[PDB]
Amino acid sequence: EKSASVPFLSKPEKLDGSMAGDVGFDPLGISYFIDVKWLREAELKHGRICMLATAGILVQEVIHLPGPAFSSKFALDAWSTAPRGGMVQILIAIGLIEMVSNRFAITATDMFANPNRKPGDLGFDPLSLGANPATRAKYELSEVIHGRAAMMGLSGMIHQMIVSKQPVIDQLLNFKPVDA
């Protein structure tokens, strides 16, 4: 009757514990008004993008592609210094990827029209690592927890970079507490 994550609040009714990472954490009750399938698809997309974002912010500080355009340890500066045409190309490619991966069903009214469509399952398993039922549940839980951790880490990284004005590794190695 009570949520596992927040004991004093009641268990979210729409969260039945089937989904990975479900600890009954929905204090504001979004699941009541928004389909949990849509919410989980959004959660997985956010977590995946933030996994890649954290990896990129950490890696492109140490290894870069050749060229002055790509030579920027600071990630917010890389955003501007990288070739603008290339960035627009990435945007267009992301759009085409969304379209094809979602199979033209990219809206809240048609995304899950097919009963086969499952939240977050875009048909992406190039090496077929998810075909093992024994490890599939563990992999799902790991993916959700990784997405959550990476979301928090990416937010922290972006804002600490706004504050310090230095890369993440550089900040941690040469830390200077905020003064005004």
Partner: protein
């Protein structure tokens, strides 16, 4: 250049900038330094100077009056003046109209459409608001599938 002069190199534009800055400085001369009025007037001067400099570099054309003029004929050198801004409008407006029409149909197929139109079903309304981002292809799909245009024999009309 079309029929006017670039605004970055116009004595009229420079004179207007000078007049604005001088008005602000005259207003500032009567306030102590560091007081909120002095800081506000200084920020106003900075904003005026930044606006004039940005207008100069934007490539805007200026007439004898010293004010930027817009060339809304289709010229690609002045697209940012009407066409790209207007494309952003058309995008947003088609979004609004498409989602509103979708909600009208959703309420039409309900127990109490009038209740749904005065007291809204905001989960479904937000659903449609989300859908509205590909309204061009969606609207054309509706048109070609025949769900958009109604037949002449199915729309009420007055007698001749």
């Amino acid at each position: 250049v079309a029929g006017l002069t670039p605004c970055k190199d116009s004595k009229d534009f420079q004179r207007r900038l000078d007049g604005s800055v001088k008005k602000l400085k005259t207003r500032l001369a009567k306030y102590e330094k560091g007081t909120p009025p002095a800081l506000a007037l200084e920020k106003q001067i900075e904003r005026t100077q930044a606006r004039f400099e940005r207008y100069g570099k934007a490539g805007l054309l200026c007439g004898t009056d010293g004010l930027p003029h817009l060339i809304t004929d289709g010229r690609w050198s002045h697209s940012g003046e009407f066409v790209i801004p207007g494309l952003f409008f058309l995008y947003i407006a088609g979004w609004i109209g498409w989602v509103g029409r979708s909600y009208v149909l959703f309420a039409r197929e309900s127990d109490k459409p009038t209740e749904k139109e005065i007291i809204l079903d905001v989960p479904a309304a937000l659903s449609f608001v989300s859908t509205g981002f590909i309204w061009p292809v969606s609207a054309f799909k509706e048109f070609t599938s025949g769900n958009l245009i109604a037949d002449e024999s199915e729309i009420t009309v007055s007698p001749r």
